[PDB]
Amino acid sequence: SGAIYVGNYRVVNRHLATHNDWANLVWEDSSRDLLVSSTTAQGCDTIARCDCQTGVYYCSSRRKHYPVSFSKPSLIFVEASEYYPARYQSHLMLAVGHSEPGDCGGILRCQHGVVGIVSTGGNGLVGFADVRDLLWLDE
């Protein structure tokens, strides 16, 4: 589990979105595994606005924060699941590292702030859904 809280928006994995996220939907994108919903309180997470390729991610399955080198966001093949069929998920970044399905929602961070959240995994490769391009989260 896990979310990003910035201004009056909440960012979660689209496959883990609640009924309340859907009732207060701002924007969702199946191909990115992203959903944004509105909040009453004002969040204060800082979004990175960079091209960093090193960061630190939180892994709930190990109660540890790990440093990783990740690829630039792109279209990558993600195996079928109970949430989506076999598809190409866009804006995805991979890193050599540990992850389990329940690790989705953990934040990836660089020196400049929040980069994105855990979204895919397997084969010892963790996939992060990027958020640095969503400039409207700050405005």
Ligand X SMILES: Cn1cc2c(CC(=O)N3CCC[C@H](C(N)=O)C3)cccc2n1
Active-site residues, by number, are: 15, 33, 104
Binding of ligand X by 122 (CB under 6 A):
yes
Q: Is 50 annotated as a binding residue?
A: yes
Binding of ligand X by 124 (CB under 6 A):
no
In the complex, the smallest distance separating the C-beta of residue 89 from ligand X, rounded to whole angstroms, is 6
Binding of ligand X by 94 (CB under 6 A):
no
Binding of ligand X by 130 (CB under 6 A):
no
**Quick one: 85 or 135, whose CB is closer to ligand X?**
85
Q: Is the CB of residue 122 less than 8 Å from the CB of residue 79?
A: yes
Matching residue, tokens 């199946």: 30
Residues 6 or more apart whose CB falls under 8 angstroms from that of 6 comprise 43, 44, 45, 46, 47, 114, 137, 138
12-20, 43-51, 57-65, 87-95 -> range binding Zn ion (CB under 5 A): 43-51
Q: How far is CA 58 from CA 38, 117, 133, in A?
A: 24, 9, 21
Binding of ligand X by 12 (CB under 6 A):
no
- Judged by CB under 6 A, the residue of 51, 74, 101, 136 near ligand X is 101
Beta bridge partners of 44: 6
Q: Is 110 annotated as a binding residue?
A: yes
Q: Is the CB of residue 137 less than 8 Å from the CB of residue 37?
A: no
